[PDB]
Amino acid sequence: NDIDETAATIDTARALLKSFGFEAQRHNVRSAVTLLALAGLKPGDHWADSTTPRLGVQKIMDWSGAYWAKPYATGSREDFRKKTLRQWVDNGFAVLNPDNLNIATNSQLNEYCLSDEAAQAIRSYGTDAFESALVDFLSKASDTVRARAEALRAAMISVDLADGDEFLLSPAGQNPLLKKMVEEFMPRFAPGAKVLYIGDTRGKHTRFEKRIFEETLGLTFDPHGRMPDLVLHDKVRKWLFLMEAVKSKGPFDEERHRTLRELFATPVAGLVFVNCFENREAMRQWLPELAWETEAWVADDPDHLIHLNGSRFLGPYER
């Protein structure tokens, strides 16, 4: 599944729409292709590429058939209008009849576009600006949509990736450990580092700094590849910390170490591998599998590190 949620797909469009606080019927496939059409997006595009064209229901349907392999018959026109666009318009997500022509609000001649508020939020999806942009939209939405969006977030844990940049995770799995990796490990051992990748350990939600990876570091990825749970870039030391919130899937062992050394190979930054655990008790079962030339960190003894291997440790005694 996609490491990059700035990539526009039907699946991310549905996730985006759920995130805005819509009910299931306004974040299904029909509603997803409607958003992709109203945003002017095609496979390969990213949310930042979104535009705000004006479209009638037929053209939304044509756009879906052309680019998203979801053709619709003329008889689905009413569904688009009454089961997607109506609720969007009511919540100020879409604008009905932006040309402001003198036509009935229920007419299939109406065109639609995304509101300025929805658009600014949409364009920021998958980035550190999204949550702040969304506030502006939500302040104008229906009370129920606002309540739904608020409750989804209240039931998540919040991780401070940087000043003013909170990343939300479900409370499940090793997400509490991941929060500690960011909030306790980083300030101690890599303060000021930028989070270039973090992925929900139980969900599809990620942050992926594509441009920095590609333009700064010269790195590209399998869009559906496995990643370390957390990648930090310390630009003073020119290091990438590749870090794992070790779950049943296991640690950086010898194979993963080799694989990741290749994946993240660049002359712009050296690699530091850290396997993370909630405590040494949890680390026990993975101990024999940890790759040499890696570190280990346990959240309940956060000032310490366990180093598996090198010459840097073998200096002579200085009396």
Q: Where are the domains of the chain?
A: 1-156, 157-318
Task: With beta carbons less than 8 A apart as the criterion, state whether 5 and 209 touch.
Answer: no
Nearest Cα to Cα of residue 296 among 226, 234, 238, 245: 245
Task: With beta carbons less than 8 A apart as the criterion, state whether 178 and 229 touch.
Answer: yes
- Domain 1-156 superfamily per CATH: BsuBI/PstI restriction endonuclease, N-terminal domain (1.10.10.1820)
d(CA 93, CA 141): 8
Torsion, Cα of 139, 140, 141, 144 (10° steps): 50
Place of tokens 């990748």: 197
**Same fold for the domain at 1-156 and the one at 157-318?**
no
**For strand 239-245 and strand 270-277, is the pairing parallel, antiparallel, or unpaired?**
parallel
- Resolution, given in Å to one decimal, reads 2.0
d(CA 277, CA 284): 10
- For 299, other C-beta atoms within 10 Å of its C-beta total 20
Amino acid of residue 182: V
What is the token pair recorded at 68? 């998203």
CATH class of 157-318: alpha beta
d(CA 89, CA 273): 49
Residue 7 forms beta bridges with which residues? 46
R_g of the chain, CA atoms, integer Å: 23
Nearest Cα to Cα of residue 158 among 182, 135, 136, 138: 182
Place of tokens 């026990």: 284
Nearest Cα to Cα of residue 196 among 179, 217, 172, 226: 217
Amino acid of residue 134: L
Residue 248 forms beta bridges with which residues? none
Task: With beta carbons less than 8 A apart as the criterion, state whether 219 and 266 touch.
Answer: yes
Residue 195 forms beta bridges with which residues? 232
d(CA 148, CA 153): 9
Task: With beta carbons less than 8 A apart as the criterion, state whether 265 and 296 touch.
Answer: no
Task: With beta carbons less than 8 A apart as the criterion, state whether 230 and 275 touch.
Answer: no
d(CA 195, CA 161): 6
3-class SS string, the chain = CCCCCCECCHHHHHHHHHHCCCCHHHCCHHHHHHHHHHCCCCCCCEHHHCCCCCECHHHHHHHHHHHCCCCCCHHHHHHHHHHHHHHHHHCCCEEECCCCCCCCCCCCCCCEEECHHHHHHHHCCCCCCHHHHHHHHHCCCCHHHHHHHHHHHHCCEEEEEECCEEEEECCCCCHHHHHHHHHHHHHHHCCCCEEEEEECCCCCCEEECHHHHHHHCCCCCCCCCCCCCEEEEECCCCEEEEEEECCCCCCCCHHHHHHHHHHCCECCEEEEEEEEECCHHHHHHHHHHCCCCEEEEECCCCCCCEEECCHHHCCCCCC
41 dihedral zone (left: phi>0; alpha: psi -120 to 50; beta): beta
d(CA 163, CA 256): 32
**For strand 294-298 and strand 306-308, is the pairing parallel, antiparallel, or unpaired?**
antiparallel
